[PDB]
Structures are given as structure tokens and as C-alpha cells.
Write a protein that binds this DNA or RNA. Structure first.
Ligand SMILES: [Mg+2]
Ligand SMILES: [Mg+2]
Ligand SMILES: [Mg+2]
Ligand SMILES: [Mg+2]
Ligand SMILES: [Mg+2]
Ligand SMILES: [Mg+2]
Ligand SMILES: [Mg+2]
Ligand SMILES: [Mg+2]
Ligand SMILES: [Mg+2]
Ligand SMILES: [Mg+2]
Ligand SMILES: [Mg+2]
Lengths: 68, 84, 140, 142, 100, 58, 141, 72, 206, 8
RNA sequence: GCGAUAACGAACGAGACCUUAACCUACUAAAUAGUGCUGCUAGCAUUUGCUGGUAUAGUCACUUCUUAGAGGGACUAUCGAUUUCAAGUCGAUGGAAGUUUGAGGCAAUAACAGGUCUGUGAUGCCCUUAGACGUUCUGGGCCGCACGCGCGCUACACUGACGGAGCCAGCGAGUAUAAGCCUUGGCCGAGAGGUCUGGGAAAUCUUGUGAAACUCCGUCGUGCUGGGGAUAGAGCAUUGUAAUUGUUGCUCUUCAACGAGGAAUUCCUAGUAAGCGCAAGUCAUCAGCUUGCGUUGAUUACGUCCCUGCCCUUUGUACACACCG
């Protein structure tokens, strides 16, 4: 299965809480941006964080989210 | 061939030196609690992120036992255990 | 030089390298005509990339493939893949893209393995059994 | 080509005091003859000029006698020595090929010739055990 | 002029590729024609033992490995130049063999 | 006298071992008489499996 | 177009070159052809006793034509097969050396092959001419 | 066992073949063995001769299967 | 229809194949139609193939098997009983001969006969067991369209295998007889006896 | 497991 | 994980991580990889073509395939459904890859009288220590056979046996003055094998490991038959100091049960199962064994707690050596 972990859920919502103006709805741009925002040790983990920041953006664009 | 001898820089971070010191203390009749905690505190004083001392065997009793003396933060699984 | 495109097709281990030069309708497998590809029952597997689009596309081109590795069927699939990809790459590079997109459309709509190599490979065998998933019979 | 015949076929043949089915191919009817295998019968038939495409009943008497002649005198018809059944015989040292009735006789004579000297192989033959050094843990249940 | 083959072997790839690049650079800025490096197929030294020292338990096996990486570089240069390149780039991990 | 019934909802796995599935069928003709029935093989929505007898629930 | 040996199916090419070599008749057949087995793994001699040697020479000639300086050890490996070991699993065993070497020596003195440099046996200047000829009189039907 | 298929062709059986084989929708080795009671080898030789005699047309040729039909 | 002259000569039959793709270049899919609505979506004949020897990738998702060609599913189910696993080329050769025998006998489209025997051979009601931990209990339940097809394919090849086992009649013509007979609904055939006994028990269980 | 007894 | 919440915020384990497999006509090069051209050269039609050979100087070019390092690529990406619209799940589309992308390595808190002192110049203690329980030499045994059980290999055939013919891999290993390594080719020999040379401390030679299933054409024709090759006789060689109680190989002959297997019971979800071989380990010799590797390659679910084992909650306890109480 593909249930994201807490190390990606919290790192993505920290990204959301800190760099919302610079983010976008494009995965490639979010992926490059988090490569210049965070020091991530592995590319695969980098892709998981950018994929969840994109998912969170699509959910904020669909309405207000609780807790962020 | 040429041999040079160099002193180990970080006494708290070298497990070989700490193990030799523990062996020389257990062989000197020192109590188990004082010997184990002397390296637990020496490692932390040197700045180690974590330390674990396990002593197993028989001590004045027919039945054998093992004692763990942990301290700080320690990781167990995966590559970082091979790295750190 | 001249009009030359070079490609390759792959199956499990078999790999066929195809050279497509400008010439007559010559289509060879390791220097041999396609009318005698073995095994016989699969000769239409390598006949498929030609008669499906129509053989007129091969008037102006000559194809020489070199297939090594794998087994008999894996080599048949490697040759037919190398042929289909070589023809597409030639149209894409030295002919109008209308022909290349028509060929890619018919090929993909008919069979996916014609242009994209199948990624399935053999699983390693693991101890405790005679196969990848099979295990030694247990007794109580 | 397909050919037909009437009255020439012999339904039951008798070779070396053994009844041989006449509708079997000649090579395997002689393979029915004890002491004559497929490898030996192909060669005695080629030395006797009996074409293998004939059934046993198809065969004539002249060829049948030429076959029993080959079977009884093999070395005289350029059959190689290494191809024979019983080579370097114990008593007279000559190359032989024993046949239907001679086979069990000389096999017997070999068993008694070994038991008289009371060798281990003869002992295990007497006991009915495996004699060639085989394990008897799981197979001596007959 | 002198046709020289240099064989580079090691267990770890980081230092092997560092030495290889440093030597190619010094054979580049010095106008010496070179052929290489040719990346030889890496050798996997595999040993598969049983985990259990006794013969009790589930039949589990360890499989240790020791990868050996090999590069060969061809140089056309005098021996003084080649020896001083070797001494500039001497490294404990990587072994070097020079053959004429 | 076979009757054909379109499925509109897969209810859930039933039976002791879970090898049979409850499904809600609707008749192709006379789009009424909706029935709950059990089916053995794997089922998606829009499977037209036919029924020998209709007047029985499951 | 120029027809070659590689342009004809093997089965009827070998049956045709074998037929030509038999009717032509100059190939010399060793005296043990009625006795021997092709391989130690085989259990019976070839069923077509009179013509098997000719067919084998035709196969050897075509195979060497399509390849380069194959030795007799390689031909033994090529024509060897699975041995019928009783209860143990099957294994590959080479064909007879004498049979292959005699076939190639007879064909070498009839003019189709010769000893190649750095080992093996190339196909002759006339070996190509007459194999391609047989191919031409092979594909008209 | 119980088979006892005929392997030798007499004249009565020969003419039985030439009188019965023409009235067949599909002839092969097994149909001939099953219903004409002849052996397999004799069936194979019968097919190879019946084609030369024109009674049977070979639709498809293979070693393990020989598919033939009536020529009428 | 024009014959295209190449330096490498191409046979006449394969040159007729640019107009149409036919199974083994002999049988056309154009005139084939399923005379039953319930198996149309699960017997795949819309995409023609030349040889039934195709690739896999159809054993991954749930209803992906319905997209595999029906003839390739038949030759896949044919290769059973251990000694035949992996002998796909042998299975394809036997099936290829079987279609010819089905064509020479009774004179119709052979792949129409295979489809008819498969639509006519899958039982529509099966009696599943509902035993509560040992006790004997049976309940009649329906069979999904996918299972009807793949039980038809299982029964035709099982019946052909057993009719050709230890019998002089060859497997290709045992499959041909089984397919034609099941196509015409005769109760003499296996997979019609099995289907009747199954649907009979299902009638005696509801 | 056994007691070695001598003869010579 | 969402969510509910006297809890909030954390750590280990899981996951991350590491190795391997699948993509890259995008970098970097490669005479220990391949190709196209070019010399020189052969055969067939003569159409200038098609197949070859040769080139450690043609003192050519290139990296598509081959190798391996630096990177890129997948994160459930996009679109539809269901869902607390949440975590997720199911379909398509794009994609090399959309089952944790496939497979493994590592792997928590305690613990077991689980297995090894027959791995240790690891060890405490007990026994022996000169007619040794030390070490060495000779011979026998570990193989011994009324029997019960387990892991497997051959088979019961025609989806097959022989006889010819076709004819494709990958993982690896390899020596020197040794004490004998991998062995091509030529020549003898029915075979096994013998003899003379050459290559390799190795992407170079063994090796294109021309492996087996597999494919084609023939013989056989449902027969314990040409399935099966045990049980044995005779003979010929190989390894070794030594083959007898037959090391193994080869020739002829001998032609057994077995005609698909009761009660029970094992393994298994995709290049998987099943066939099919090959290498490495032990190794002077011997592989029906393991560890890997590739060749051919499926049927059927993608669900449940019906059996079995384990886990959780409530509950009762006179148990805590914990119901073997
Ligand atoms: Mg982990
Ligand atoms: Mg397997
Ligand atoms: Mg004498
Ligand atoms: Mg072979
Ligand atoms: Mg062969
Ligand atoms: Mg995993
Ligand atoms: Mg120990
Ligand atoms: Mg076991
Ligand atoms: Mg065969
Ligand atoms: Mg063992
Ligand atoms: Mg309580």
C-alpha cells in the first residue's frame, strides 16, 4: 500500500506552514522547490514529501483544511 | 615496514578503549554497578549520542545472567547502524 | 554518411540490434532471410511488424539485425521488437512524422510489446525452497 | 509400395526352442529370443542380408537358417569381438555369445563356480541380498 | 615515447574514481594522448555460508559479497612523467600496476 | 425460461469461507422486481449473469 | 538475385546435397558404417544405414559453410545429445570423434573443405561454388 | 490385450479398404484404425498408397497428424 | 490485394495477410458472433491475432483475463498435468491441427465452433458447499460470467485430455471431437455430462 | 565408554 | 494513518536506509565490447547486389547495443468514481516502471534451561596423562538388514519413445618448478579414452560454455510394446598408495515392480507454480544434495475467519514455578 508516514505528513505540512507563497500545483516545481528548501538525505523521500505537499495544495484548493 | 603509534583522540568514542578499561576493572574486582556506570558516564561526558553496555556471564552465582546498562539515544535497525 | 538509424529490441535476456540503411527491401536476421526464421510455428510473430502496416514501407529501407542471448522465443520477440522500433525510428528521423505517428498508433493499438520492451524478469531463487516462492515440503 | 500375400505368413514362429510371434518385425522378434537384444539383432540382420522391413512371418526359411547360423557362429561373420555377450570365457578363454537355452545354463554355472570358491558375492547371492555393495536399508523388502 | 598500460583495482569505488579522474586530468593538461579509462566488468566475490554454527534450527544461509572494481588506462609518455604522476596520486586504498 | 438480471450493487462477502458474494440484481426487461441474490464467481457492477428462477431472495 | 546456401531451408537442402553426393559417388565411406553408433549417449545405430553417412557429410558441410573454422570437438559437441542414464538425470555427451573426423576427411579429399589457419576447417573455393549450385537446383520446385 | 488389430493386409482386407475408404468424410490414421480395424503402420502405408491411387486428397501434411479427405 | 515485389521474396499467403489478419492465416474472425448476450464481454474476439502464442501480463489485475484472446486462453488451459507445463509450442501445434479437423468435419467456421462449445459448456448454476465446520451442507448459487467462461475452458480441455489418455486417437482430434460435440449440445460429451450433473444438483439444492 | 582390557 | 479523545508533544520497532532487477539513441570514454566505413580478399547472379574471411597499424570514425560512475526518472502522476469526502480503496489515461515498482539485507522490548564446550591456543569444573582418553602406522566400521517414518530422483507413455535433422542462455571458476588448474586444435580409437602442440594469474583462453527441454522429417501403433531399465552375468578403461563388500566411465547380454496411487497431508499468486538444464561448495575421484543462475512458462483467487496458529478487548480466577498451575 501507499499510506504515507508521519515523517512525510508532518514534513509536508511544515512546508505548507512555511512556504505557501512559493509553492504551486505542479509536482515538478514543488519537487525542485523542496530541493532548495529542505536538506533531504534521499531522493525517494524528497519525492514523497513533494507528492504530499502537492496533495495538500489540491485539498486546500478544494476548500479549507483543519489544523493548517 | 615501519610502525608508528598514535594515541586515540576521543577516549569516550572509542569502544575498544572503553572495553579494555572495563575488562581491567572487572578483573580488578571493581563492582559491576560502578564499572558499568563509569563508562556510561564517560561516554556521555565525551559527548556520545548513545551507549549500551551488556555484561553477561556468572558472578558468584551458579546461574548465569546478563545485565544491560543503556544511556541516551540508540538506533538498532538498517544501514545507519553500520554507519553511526 | 547515408540514411542510417540504429536501434535494439529486448526480451527477458535476448537483445537484437537492428541497423536500418537506405536501400532495397532487404530484411535479414544475422545475415539470413526472414523466410526461414525458427521455430516455424512462430514465424508469423516476426512477420507481424511487416504485414500489419504493409510491406511497402520497406521498399526504400534495408534492415540487418543481430540477435544474441535469451532463448528461441525470447529471440523471436527481440527480433520483431527491434524491427518495429527500427522502422519507427527511421520514419521519425528521415521521413515525415505523419508516417511515424501512424506506425506508432497502429502498433500500440494492436500490441504493446512491439515497441516497449517487456520489463518482466526472472525472480531470484531463495534458500529454504527449490524456487522463488516454492518451499521445501514440511513434515510434522 | 503396399504388397499383398496369401499363405506365406506363419502366425507362430519357433526359433531356438522359443515360440515367436510372426507379426512382429524381424529385429524385435529376435529381440524376443533371449540373449538377443535390439543392438545385436540389427547387426545379425545386416550381416545376414535380411532387410528389416519384413515381418517375422514374412521371412523365408533360407533367411531364417542364415540367421540361426549367424547367431550360432558370430565371430566367423565379421561381428567385432567387443560387441559380444560372453568374452574371455573362464575355462577356454575364447569369445562367446550365449543364447536362449545356453544363457541360464552358463549364468547358473557362474553362480556355482563363485559359490564353490565361497566368495562374498556368492554369499550375498545365496542370501538373496543386493550383491553389488548396495545399501539394504530400504530395498530388501521382497 | 613509451606505450604504458596502467591497471587500477580496488574494493571501494569512490577512491578509485577519484584517482582515475585525477590521473586523467594530469594526463590531459599535459598534452599526452591517452586511451581510457575502460571500465572493466566489476567482480562480485560471493561466499554463501550457513548461519548456524551447529546444525540445529531453520536452514538459514548468509551470502557475503566483496565487489572488486577495475579500470585500465593507456598512456603514451616517458617513464619519468609516469612515475611522478603515480607519486603525485598515490593512495592507500587503490592499488596500481604499471606494465610496458 | 431463463431470466436475465443486471447487477447494480455488490453488497458484501457472505458465506462461511467468504467465497460467495451478495449482490443486488435488476432485471433487463421490466426494470423492477429488484432482488438480493448470491453469486459465486468474482463480480463487478454491470455483470449480466442470468437467473434460472427469479422469485427467491438470498 | 544470387541464391546462397543460407537462403534455403536446411532440411531439404541437406536431403538434396546428400542425394547429389550419393549419386555422384566419389565420397569414400569407412568400413564400420554398418556397426557404429553416432554417439555414446545413443543406444541404437541410425535406421537409414546406407545413406546416413552421406547425410551427415552434407550436414557437416552446410554447418561449416555457415560458421567459421569449427573443429571436430565442436562437431562432437554439436551432434551430441542427452544420455539415457538410468535413474540419474540426463547429461550431454559428445558424438563419435571417428565418425565426424572421417566425414570431414573424406569431404576434404573430395574437395569441399580445407584446414583453416589458426585451427578449424574453412569451406573451399569450390565448396561455395557447388553448395550454392545445389541450392540453385534446390529451390526451383 | 484385447486390441488384436490387423497388421498384415490380405486380399479380402485389401479390397475392403478400397471398398470402404472412399465413403468417408475425413480419413486419417486414427479414423482408419478405429473403424477399419487395421494397424497404425498399415494405415500409414495405406494412406501413402491411396494418395498415389487418387482416392484421398491431402488437405494438410504433418508427421504427428495427417489430414486427408475424399477425392470424390 | 496487389502483390508487392521485394528483394527478399515474401510468400503469397502472407502477402494476402496485409488485407486481413487471420488466425494461422486460414480462419477469419469477421463472421464470428456469440449467440448469447451474457458472455460477449468476457470472450474477447474483437482483436484478431495471427498465432495464439502471445505474451502474458494478463494474470495481474482482477478482470484482465477477459481481455485475453479466447483461443490463447484455450491453448493456455490445454498445457496441464505436469509433463506439459511450459510446452506452449506443442499446445499451439495441437490446437492448430484441431481447428483444421473441426473445419473438415461438418463444414463450418472452426472458431465459431470453439466459441459455441464454450458458451454452451459453462454451467449457469453451481451448488457451493456451506458446511459449518465438518457437517455436510450444500446451497445452490449463481456463477459469474467470468467463471462460466473459465469453467467452460477448464472442462473442454480436461475432457479432451482424458479422452486422449492411453488411446490411439490423438489429442488434436479428441479436442476436435469434444469441441464439435459440445458445440452441438450432445449429452455424450464430457463437460456436458459434468454441466448437467452440476445443474441437476443445483436444482436439487434450492 | 568402554574399559580397555589387554591380552598380550 | 484518518478520526474520536485527559491528554500534548516525542523515541525504538515498522517506515525510512542499503544491495540488486527493469528505463536512459541524455553525459564520459573504451584493440580485454560492439557497429559502420575502408584496404586486401573470396563464392552466387552477373545489376553496382547478397553472404563471408582478413586488418594488436586502415597508426579509421562512433558509442545504439556491451561494460560501469555521475545523474535523471515514480511521488499513486492526471482524470473518474466510492469513503466521515478524511485516511484510503477501486477503475481507466499517460508511462519502462502504478502489486510497498519486483526481490532481498538489516531488524524493537523483554525471554527460552531451544542447539552447539565434536569450530576455536573461548572457557570453569570433572576424567585421563606414558601399557595415554595425547599423536602416529596397519586392517576393519561408519554402507552392516526380519522392520517403521521423513526430504527427494526416475517412471507408469502417442501432449510419447527411439533415428536422423534444426540448434538459443545467465550466475561463476581457473596455475609456476608446481607436485599439478581451466583446456581449444590436429592425429589415432566403436566408444570411454590416448598422444603432440597452443591460450589464460584472466571481459583476452577454456567459451558463442553450439546445455537440456524445445522444433522438423521418419520408424512404432495402445501391447507391460520399440514405455521403464532395475535385478544380474561376461568384458574393456579411468582416478588413486590401495577399488574385494562391484569409486566412476564405456560394450554386449539380463527386461523386475510400476498401467496415475486409500485414510491423511505439503508448497504455491506472475516471468510466480510447474517442467528443463548449467555453474559453484564440498572435491585426488564420486552430486539422485544444497547455494545460485538462466531456458520453456501456465490454471485459479485477489476473498474469509469455516479449519489451524498467533494477536487484541471485555470477563472470572483460590493461578504468579503462572493450567505441564
Ligand atoms: Mg527497516
Ligand atoms: Mg522453479
Ligand atoms: Mg583358456
Ligand atoms: Mg545440443
Ligand atoms: Mg541432436
Ligand atoms: Mg520489500
Ligand atoms: Mg563451542
Ligand atoms: Mg529437509
Ligand atoms: Mg527427440
Ligand atoms: Mg549435503
Ligand atoms: Mg484480571
Amino acid at each position: 500500500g501507499r499510506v504515507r508516514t508521519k515523517t512525510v505528513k508532518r514534513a509536508s505540512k511544515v512546508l505548507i506552514e512555511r512556504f505557501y507563497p512559493k509553492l504551486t500545483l505542479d509536482f515538478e516545481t514543488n519537487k525542485r522547490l523542496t530541493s532548495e528548501i529542505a536538506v533531504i538525505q534521499s531522493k525517494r523521500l524528497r519525492n514523497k514529501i513533494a507528492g504530499y505537499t502537492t496533495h495538500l495544495m489540491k485539498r486546500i484548493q478544494k476548500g479549507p483544511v483543519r489544523g493548517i | 615496514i615501519a610502525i608508528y603509534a598514535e594515541r586515540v583522540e576521543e577516549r569516550g568514542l572509542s569502544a575498544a578503549v572503553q572495553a579494555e578499561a572495563l575488562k581491567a576493572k572487572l578483573l580488578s574486582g571493581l563492582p559491576i554497578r560502578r564499572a558499568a556506570y563509569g563508562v556510561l558516564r564517560f561516554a556521555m561526558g565525551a559527548g556520545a549520542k548513545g551507549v549500551e553496555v551488556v555484561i553477561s556471564g556468572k558472578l558468584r552465582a551458579a546461574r548465569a545472567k546478563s545485565q544491560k546498562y543503556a544511556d541516551g539515544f540508540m538506533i538498532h535497525s538498517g544501514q545507519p547502524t553500520r554507519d553511526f | 554518411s547515408t540514411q542510417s538509424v540504429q536501434t535494439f529490441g529486448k526480451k527477458k535476456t535476448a537483445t537484437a540490434v537492428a541497423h536500418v540503411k537506405a536501400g532495397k527491401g532487404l530484411i535479414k536476421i544475422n545475415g539470413s532471410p526472414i523466410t526461414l526464421v525458427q521455430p516455424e510455428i512462430l514465424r508469423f510473430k516476426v512477420y507481424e511488424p511487416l504485414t500489419l502496416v504493409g510491406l511497402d514501407k520497406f521498399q526504400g529501407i534495408d534492415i540487418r539485425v543481430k540477435v544474441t542471448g535469451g532463448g528461441h522465443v525470447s529471440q523471436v520477440y527481440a527480433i520483431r521488437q527491434a524491427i518495429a522500433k527500427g522502422l519507427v525510428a527511421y520514419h521519425q528521423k528521415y521521413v515525415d512524422e505523419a508516417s511515424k505517428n501512424e506506425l506508432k498508433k497502429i502498433f500500440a493499438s494492436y500490441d504493446k510489446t512491439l515497441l516497449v520492451a517487456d520489463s518482466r524478469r526472472m525472480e531470484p531463487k531463495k534458500f529454504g525452497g527449490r524456487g522463488a516462492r516454492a518451499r521445501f515440503q514440511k513434515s510434522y | 509400395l503396399v504388397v499383398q500375400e496369401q499363405g506365406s505368413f506363419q502366425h507362430i514362429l519357433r526359433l531356438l526352442n522359443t515360440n515367436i510371434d510372426g507379426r512382429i518385425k524381424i529385429m524385435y522378434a529376435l529381440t524376443k529370443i533371449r540373449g538377443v537384444g535390439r543392438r545385436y539383432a540389427n547387426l545379425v540382420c545386416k550381416k545376414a542380408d535380411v532387410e528389416l522391413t519384413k515381418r517375422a512371418g514374412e521371412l523365408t526359411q533360407e533367411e531364417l537358417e542364415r540367421i540361426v547360423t549367424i547367431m550360432q557362429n558370430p565371430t566367423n561373420y565379421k561381428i567385432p569381438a567387443w560387441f559380444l555377450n560372453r568374452q574371455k570365457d573362464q575355462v577356454d578363454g575364447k569369445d562367446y555369445h550365449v543364447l536362449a537355452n545356453n544363457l541360464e545354463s552358463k549364468l547358473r554355472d557362474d553362480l556355482e563356480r563363485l559359490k564353490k570358491i565361497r566368495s562374498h558375492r556368492g554369499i550375498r547371492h545365496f542370501w538373496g541380498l543386493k550383491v553389488r555393495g548396495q545399501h539394504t536399508k530400504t530395498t530388501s523388502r521382497g | 615515447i613509451h606505450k604504458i598500460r596502467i591497471t587500477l583495482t580496488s574494493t571501494k569505488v569512490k577512491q578509485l574514481e577519484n584517482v582515475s579522474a585525477n590521473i586523467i586530468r594530469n594526463a590531459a593538461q599535459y598534452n599526452i594522448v591517452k586511451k581510457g579509462p575502460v571500465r572493466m566488468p566489476t567482480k562480485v566475490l560471493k561466499i554463501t555460508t550457513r548461519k548456524t554454527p551447529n546444525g540445529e534450527g531453520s536452514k538459514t544461509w548468509d551470502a557475503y559479497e566483496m565487489r572488486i572494481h577495475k579500470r585500465v588506462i593507456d598512456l603514451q609518455a616517458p617513464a619519468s612523467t609516469v612515475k611522478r604522476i603515480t607519486q603525485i596520486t598515490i593512495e592507500p586504498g587503490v592499488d596500481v600496476e604499471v606494465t610496458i | 425460461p431463463v431470466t436475465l438480471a443486471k447487477v447494480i450493487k455488490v453488497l458484501g462477502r457472505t458465506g462461511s469461507r467468504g467465497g460467495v458474494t451478495q449482490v443486488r440484481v435488476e432485471f433487463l426487461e421490466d426494470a423492477s422486481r429488484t432482488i438480493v441474490r448470491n453469486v459465486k464467481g468474482p463480480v463487478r457492477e454491470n455483470d449480466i449473469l442470468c437467473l434460472m428462477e427469479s422469485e427467491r431472495e438470498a | 538475385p544470387g541464391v546462397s546456401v543460407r537462403d534455403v531451408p536446411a532440411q531439404d537442402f541437406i536431403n538434396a546435397y546428400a542425394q547429389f553426393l550419393q549419386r555422384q559417388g566419389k565420397l569414400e565411406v569407412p568400413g564400420y558404417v554398418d556397426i557404429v553408433k553416432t554417439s555414446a549417449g545413443n543406444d541404437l545405430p541410425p535406421q537409414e544405414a546406407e545413406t546416413w553417412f552421406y547425410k551427415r557429410a552434407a550436414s557437416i558441410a552446410r554447418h561449416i559453410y555457415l560458421r567459421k573454422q569449427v573443429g571436430v570437438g565442436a562437431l562432437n559437441k554439436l551432434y551430441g545429445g542427452a544420455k539415457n542414464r538410468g535413474f540419474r538425470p540426463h547429461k550431454h555427451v559428445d558424438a563419435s570423434g571417428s565418425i565426424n573426423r572421417k566425414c570431414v576427411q573424406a569431404l576434404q579429399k573430395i574437395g569441399v573443405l580445407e584446414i583453416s589457419p589458426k585451427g578449424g576447417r574453412r569451406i573451399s573455393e569450390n565448396g561455395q561454388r557447388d553448395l550454392d549450385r545445389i541450392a540453385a537446383q534446390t529451390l526451383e520446385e | 490385450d484385447k486390441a488384436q488389430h490387423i497388421v498384415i493386409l490380405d486380399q479380402e482386407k485389401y479390397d475392403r479398404i478400397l471398398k470402404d475408404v472412399p465413403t468417408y468424410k475425413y480419413v486419417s490414421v486414427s479414423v482408419l484404425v478405429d473403424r477399419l480395424k487395421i494397424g497404425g503402420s498399415l494405415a500409414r502405408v495405406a494412406l501413402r498408397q491411396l494418395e498415389e491411387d487418387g482416392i484421398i486428397t491431402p488437405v494438410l501434411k504433418h508427421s504427428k497428424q495427417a489430414i486427408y479427405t475424399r477425392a470424390q | 490485394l496487389q502483390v508487392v515485389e521485394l528483394a527478399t521474396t515474401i510468400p503469397l499467403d502472407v502477402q494476402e495477410a496485409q488485407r486481413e489478419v487471420k488466425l494461422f492465416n486460414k480462419w477469419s474472425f469477421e463472421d464470428v458472433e456469440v449467440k448469447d448476450v451474457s458472455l460477449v464481454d468476457y470472450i474477447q474476439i474483437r482483436n484478431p491475432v495471427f498465432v495464439s502464442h502471445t505474451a502474458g501480463k494478463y494474470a495481474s489485475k482482477r478482470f484482465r483475463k477477459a481481455q485475453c484472446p479466447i483461443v490463447e486462453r484455450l491453448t493456455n488451459s490445454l498445457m496441464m498435468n505436469g509433463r506439459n507445463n511450459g510446452k506452449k509450442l506443442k499446445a499451439v501445434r495441437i490446437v492448430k491441427h484441431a481447428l483444421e479437423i473441426i473445419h473438415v468435419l461438418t463444414e463450418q467456421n472452426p472458431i465459431q465452433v470453439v466459441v459455441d462449445a464454450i458458451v454452451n459448456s459453462g454451467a449457469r448454476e453451481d451448488s457451493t458447499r456451506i458446511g459449518s465446520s465438518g457437517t455436510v451442507r450444500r446451497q445452490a448459487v449463481d456463477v459469474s460470467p467470468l467463471r462460466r467462461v473459465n469453467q467452460a475452458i477448464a472442462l473442454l480441455t480436461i475432457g479432451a485430455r482424458e479422452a486422449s489418455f492411453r488411446n490411439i486417437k490423438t489429442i488434436a482430434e479428441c479436442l476436435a471431437e469434444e469441441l464439435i460435440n459440445a458445440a452441438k449440445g450432445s449429452s455424450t460429451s464430457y463437460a456436458i455430462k459434468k454441466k448437467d450433473e452440476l445443474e441437476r444438483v443445483a436444482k436439487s439444492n434450492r | 565408554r568402554k574399559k580397555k582390557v589387554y591380552t598380550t
